[PDB]
What we know:
Chain E: It is found in: Nucleus. Chain E: Belongs to the SNF2/RAD54 helicase family. SWR1 subfamily. Chain A: One of its GO terms (cellular component) is ribonucleoprotein complex. Chain A: It is an enzyme of class 3 (hydrolase). Chain A is an alpha/beta fold. Chain A folds into three domains: 1-107 and 231-345, Rossmann fold, CATH 3.40.50; 108-230, CATH 2.40.50.360; 346-429, Orthogonal Bundle (Helicase, Ruva Protein, domain 3). Chain A is 36% helix and 24% strand. Chain A has helices spanning 32-47, 65-76, 97-107, 161-166, 224-232, 237-243, 253-269, 289-299, 332-335, 348-361, 368-379, 383-388, 390-399, 407-416, 420-428, and strands at residues 24-25, 28-29, 54-58, 82-86, 109-126, 129-132, 137-146, 151-156, 173-178, 184-190, 204-205, 213-223, 272-276, 278-282, 306-311, 316-317, 325-326, 338-342. In chain A, a hairpin with a 7-residue loop joins strand 16 (316-317) and strand 17 (325-326). The radius of gyration of chain A is 31 Å and the shape is elongated. Chain C is mainly beta. The radius of gyration of chain C is 21 Å and the shape is elongated. In chain C, strands 4-3-2-5 form a four-stranded mixed sheet. Helices cover 35% and strands 20% of the residues of chain F. In chain F, strands 3-2-1-9-10-20 form a six-stranded mixed sheet, sandwiched between helices. Chain F is globular, with a radius of gyration of 22 Å. Chains in contact: A-C, A-E, B-C, B-D, B-E, B-F, C-D, C-E, C-F, D-E, D-F, E-F. Chain B binds chain F through residues 6-7, 10-11, 48, 50-51, 53-55, 57-60, 70-76, 112-113, 116, 118-119, 121-123, 134, 165, 168-169, 171-172, 179, 183, and chain F through 1-2, 5-8, 96, 124-125, 139-141, 160-161, 163, 165-168, 308-313, 345-347, 354, 376-377, 379-380, 382, 384-387, 398, 401. Strand 5 (87-91) of chain C pairs antiparallel with strand 2 of chain E. Bound molecules: phosphothiophosphoric acid-adenylate ester (AGS) (2 copies) and magnesium ion (MG) (2 copies). One phosphothiophosphoric acid-adenylate ester binds next to helix 6 and helix 12 of chain F.
Amino acid sequence: TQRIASHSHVKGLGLDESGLAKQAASGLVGQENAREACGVIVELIKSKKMAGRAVLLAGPPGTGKTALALAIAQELGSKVPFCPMVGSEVYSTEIKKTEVLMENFRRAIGLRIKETKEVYEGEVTELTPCETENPKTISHVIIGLKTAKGTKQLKLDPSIFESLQKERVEAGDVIYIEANSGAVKRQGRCDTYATEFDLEAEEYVPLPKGDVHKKKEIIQDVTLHDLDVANARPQILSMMGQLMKPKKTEITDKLRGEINKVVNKYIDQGIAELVPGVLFVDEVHMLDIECFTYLHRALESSIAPIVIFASNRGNCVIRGTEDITSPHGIPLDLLDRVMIIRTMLYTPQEMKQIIKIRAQTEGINISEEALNHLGEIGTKTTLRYSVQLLTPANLLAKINGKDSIEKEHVEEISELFYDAKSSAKILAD
Amino acid sequence: REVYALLYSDKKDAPPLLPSDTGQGYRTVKAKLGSKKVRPWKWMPFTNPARKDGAMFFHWRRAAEEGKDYPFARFNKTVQVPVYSEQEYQLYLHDDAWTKAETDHLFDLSRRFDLRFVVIHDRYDHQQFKKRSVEDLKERYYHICAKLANVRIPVFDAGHERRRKEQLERLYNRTPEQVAEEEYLLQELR
Amino acid sequence: DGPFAFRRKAGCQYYAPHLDQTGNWPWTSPKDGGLGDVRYRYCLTTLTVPQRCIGFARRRVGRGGRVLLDRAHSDYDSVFHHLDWRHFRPRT
Amino acid sequence: NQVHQRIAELRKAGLWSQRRLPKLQEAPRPKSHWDYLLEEMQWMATDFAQERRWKVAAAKKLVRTVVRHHE
Amino acid sequence: FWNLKTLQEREARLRLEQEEAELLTYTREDAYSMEYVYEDVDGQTEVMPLWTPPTPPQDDSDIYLDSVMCLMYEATPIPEAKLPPVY
Amino acid sequence: VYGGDEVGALVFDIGSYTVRAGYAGEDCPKVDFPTAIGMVVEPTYYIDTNALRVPRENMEAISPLKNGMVEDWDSFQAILDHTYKMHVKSEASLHPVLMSEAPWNTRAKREKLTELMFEHYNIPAFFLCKTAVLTAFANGRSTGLILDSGATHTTAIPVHDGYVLQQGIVKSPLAGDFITMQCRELFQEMNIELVPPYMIASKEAVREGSPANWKRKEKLPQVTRSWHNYMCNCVIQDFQASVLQVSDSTYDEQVAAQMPTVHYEFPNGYNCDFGAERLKIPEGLFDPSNVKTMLGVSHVVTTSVGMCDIDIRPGLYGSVIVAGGNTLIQSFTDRLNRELSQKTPPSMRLKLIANNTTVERRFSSWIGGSILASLGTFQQMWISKQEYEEGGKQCVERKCP
Ligand SMILES: Nc1ncnc2c1ncn2[C@@H]1O[C@H](COP(=O)(O)OP(=O)(O)OP(O)(O)=S)[C@@H](O)[C@H]1O
Ligand SMILES: Nc1ncnc2c1ncn2[C@@H]1O[C@H](COP(=O)(O)OP(=O)(O)OP(O)(O)=S)[C@@H](O)[C@H]1O
Ligand SMILES: [Mg+2]
Ligand SMILES: [Mg+2]
C-alpha cells in the first residue's frame, strides 16, 4: 500500500461505458486497442461461464503488458482471486513442474463459504432441574442466561445435563449453547466477579453484549488449492510430521476429484459460492517444452481458471528443446489455444504523460522544461530509465534546497547514471 | 420521530429513571461509601437582598454556605418604566383626554404588572376613571415614554392594533354556516 | 382590502399571522404547530447499564440537583427494547 | 367567477381569514422577575408530576415483589 | 397434558412478572458523568438538551417572548424585503 | 440558579366541602377534613370526622364559608386551631403560611383574613393566591381557562400570565349541592326513607325493593335538624359518587333505558336498581333548561372566554383545566370535551388538560400552592410581619395580586 512500486499508479483500465478506451485515464496512457481487448477479457472473467480460456499479452519490453494484467486485476476487484506467477517458479526442488502449474491453476479458483450459526450465550444465573413423575426424574433443565441487554430462561433437553457437568458450568460462568447440536461450551467466569487481588487470565471474560440469543453469519474465502493442501495433509504422526520438514507433495488427481465433489455438494446446499478467477503467468517464455505441453491439457480442463500469459522474446528458441525456434518462445500448438493481444511502442507524448503520472504518484514536483528534457531522454534510452531518474533527481533537488526538479537536476542525474545502451557502448570501447 | 410534552406525555408513560447508587447492590459499593463522610447541612436563616424589608427565611444549606448571598435574588429586575415630575407632566404630557391621576394610575399599574397590558386592562379602575380600551392604555403609555425620551424606537400605531383586534373579533363571532362557507371556499378555490 | 388594509408606518415592524398551520404551545411538535422547544423533546436514549435503548426519554434536572430521565410511552417500545432517527447515547 | 366575487366581498368585509392583518411589534423588553418565576413554576410542576408518577410505580413494584416473595 | 398445563401456567407467571415495571433507576455515571451525543450521517454531532431551572440573567439579552402571541403570529419580525412600502 | 428553595411553608386551601392542608413540597395534602363543623350553644366545636359522626344533644352543623368566602370568623379560627394542633402539630409562629382564596374575594375580607393571620396566629410570613392560578400552576400552565365545579359553584376563571382576569369570571350555582338536592328529590319521588347510618343498630339482608329490616339504635339522644340533614347529605354524596353518570351526549330516554342499571345499597339495607334516572340528574349541569336563566357548564366556559382579549382567547381555549370534586362524576370530562369541541371556533385549538383523578381534581389548588411556595424565585413575594407593621392595610392588597 504505502510504499510505491513500479505499478502503484495503475488503478485500472480506463474504459468508458461503451468499452472504448480513453486516451489517458485510471493511470493508463495509450495502448487503446490492448486495453479494449483486456476489457473484453474482464467481461469474460466476470461472466464466469468459461474455463481455461487463455490470452497472451505480446509486445516489446516496457509496453505495459504487466501493467495491463495488473489493470485487469484492479478491474476485477479483491473478490476475484488473481494469482501472479512468473515462469521461473515452476522449477521447484520439492515438486515437479506440472504440479507447480496445477497448484497455481487451483489457486485461481476461489470459493466463498457461508456459515449461519445460532447461539445462546450469556452468564449463567440458574441451573434448576425440573422434577416430574415418570409416566428423581427430570423432564427439563432450566438455564437462565444474562447479557447486557437482558435475561432469558431456556427449557433445555435433560440430556444437556452431561455437557453442563463436563464443562463444569456454575453460576457466574459465561457459556454458549449452539442450537443444532445442543452442546454447551464454557468460556470463563464473568469479569464482574474478578478482583484485582486474584490472579487468573484465561478464566475471565467480559459479560456479553447484545441479546442472549444470537444468529451469526461467518463468511470465509478459500481457494481450491487451500482445500487441496488441507485434505492432503491434515494438521504421534503429527509430532514427527511437525519435527520433520513439511515439503510440498504431488497431490493426486483422486484428491482433486474428491474436493470437486465436496465443493459441488456445498454449492448445491447453498453454503458456498464459487468465484473463478485469473492466473497470470509473466515471463512465460521461461517455461520449458514439458510445461507448455502440460498446459495444453491443463487449459482444456472444464475446471481451469482463465490464464493470462505475457512474453517479449520474439522469435526465440524454446527452452528445453534444441534449435526449435518459436514466434514468442511459445510453441505454435500452445499459441493456437491463446488469444493474442499485441502491445505497441509509445510516442514521445505518451511517454511524457506516463512520466508525469509517475512523478505525481511518487509525489515529485517536476518543472515543465525538466519534464520536456526527461521526455526526450525517454525517447532516447528507454521509458523505464527516464522514470527511474525522477526520485534521484528529486533528492538532488532537495539537497540544493529546491522544492521542484529543475532541468539542471535532471542533467546532473543523467550524467551520474547510465542506461543499458550507453553501458554497452562503454563496454564495446 | 419524537415526542413532545410538558409535564408528561400520556398516562401510560413509564416512570422517570432516578439516579441512585447501590442499585447494583450495597456490598459492591461498600468501600466507596465507607471511605468518605458527608458534609454538614444546617437549618439556617438567609437574607434575600431582593426583599426590601429584611425578613429572614430558613434554608437547608451546607455549613460553609451560611451567610452567602441568596442566588435567586439575581432574577430580581423590573421592567423599565419612566418616572415624571408634576412639572414634567404640566410642561409636556398634558392631554385634554387624560387626567393626571388617571395617567398615574395607569403607570402604577404598569409598574405592578410588568407592562402586561391585558392584566393592566383587567385591573384598570374603570369605575373611578373613564373606560379605556387596551389600545388606549398602550397609546398613552408609549406616547408618554416616547415624549419623555425625546425630552431627555418602534412607535406605537393605535389604529393598526384597533383594526387588527376588530378584524379578529369579526372572524371569531361568525356563525358555523359562515365558517363552513369559508372552508368550502378555501377547499374549492384550490 | 379597504377597511382592513395593511398600512406600514415608518419605524415599525410587524409579525405575520399564522395561516398555513394553526400555532401551538412551545412544548408541542412542529408537526402539531408548536415551536418544538428542545427542552421538552423526548428522543430515543441508550443507557450504559443496561446496555439497552430505554426508548424515548428526556434529560431533566430534578429538585435536588438530581438529573432525571423522563420517559414517554410509545406503541413500538418493545421494538426499541430489541433495538441495538435521532438516537442519543452517552459518552465520556 | 361567482366564487371570486364572493371572496372579494368577504375580503372587503374583513371576514376573509387568508388575509389577516399582522401584529405590530411591541417594544422589546428583557425578562422580569415574574417571567423567571413562571419558568421556575413550570419546571417545578413538571418535577412534581414526575415524582408522583415514580412513587406510585415504585410502591406497586415493591408490593408485588413482596407478594411474590410470599408465594 | 400436565406438562402443557404447567408450561401455560409458567408463561402466565412470566407474563405477570413482565407486565410489572422493568426499570426505576439508572446509574450515577449515566446521570452526571457522561454527556449524551448523537452523530448524523455527515458526522455532525448534537448534544441532548437538558431541561434545567432558569439561569440568572447576565445582561438584558434575555428578551421576553409572549408565548400566547406566538399562537397567532410567528416569532420573527417580517423582513423588510417582503414588507409593503409605507402607505 | 438552582432548584426551588423549601422554607418550611404551610399551604392551606379551605373550601366549602373539605379543608385541605399540608406542608409545601408535598404532592398531596396530608389532611382533608370536612369544612362543616359541629357547634354547641354554650361554643364547643367538633370539627373533624371522628367527632362529627357521633350524635350529640343540641349540636348544630354549620360552615364558616358562604358563597366561597368566610363569613363566621369564630368558626374559621376554630378550624385553623384544630388544623394546627391536631394535624400540623407545630406552632403557627414558626411556619410561613400560603392560603388560597376565591377568585371573587372582596378587599375587606382579604384584609380581615390577613389581620387574623398576623395578629392572632403571629405567623412569620403570609401570601394569598387565587385558587384558579394555583390550579393552573399545578398543571405547569401560566395561562388557561380554569373550570372549577366544587359543591358551591361551577366557575370559569381565565388566567393569563399567572393573573386571574377577574372581568372574565363567570359563576353558576349548579354544583355538587345542586346534585345533592336533585338526588334528594329523586329519593323522595321513590319514597325511599333516607336513614343515616348512625341510627342503625343492626340490619338484615333484604331483596331489591323489599322493605328495610333494620333495628334502631337505642338510647339515641335528640339531634338538631342541621346535623341530621348533614348526615343525609353525606349518604346522598356517597350515592352521587357511586351511581350517577353523565351521558356521553345529550340525554335521551331510550338510549338511557337501554344501558345497564347500577345497583346501590343504602345504609339501612335497602337496595334498588336506579335505571335511567341516574343519567337525568347530572344533565342539569349541561342542560339546565330541562330541570323542573342558568347557563350550562359548556356555556359558562364559552361565555367566560368571550369576555377576554381576543389576543388571549387562543390561549384560554388552548388550555382548559377542569378541577373540583363535582367534575369526578363518570364521563363528565368526556361530555364537556365533546360539547366544547362542538362549540369552539375551528380556527383555535382546544385542549382539555388530561389530569382526571381524585387527587388531581380535588386538590389541584393545594398542589399549585405547594409548587408556588417551593419556588426560590417566589421567596420575594412573601408578606412579612415587619411589612405588616407598616402596610397592614396598605401593602396586603398590593403585595398579593
Ligand atoms: N500505458 C501505460 N500507462 C501507464 N503506465 C504504463 C503504461 N505502460 C507501461 N507503464 C508503466 O511503465 C513500466 C513498463 O511497463 P511494463 O508493464 O513493466 O512493461 P512490460 O510489457 O511488462 O515489459 P516486459 O515484457 O515485462 S520487460 C511499468 O512501470 C508500467 O507500470
Ligand atoms: N369522586 C367523586 N365523585 C363525584 N362527586 C364527588 C366526588 N368527590 C367529591 N364529589 C363532590 O364534589 C363536591 C366537593 O368538591 P370540592 O371542589 O372538593 O368542594 P370544595 O372545593 O371543597 O368547596 P368549593 O365548593 O369549591 S368553595 C361535593 O358535592 C362532593 O359530593
Ligand atoms: Mg512485465
Ligand atoms: Mg373549590
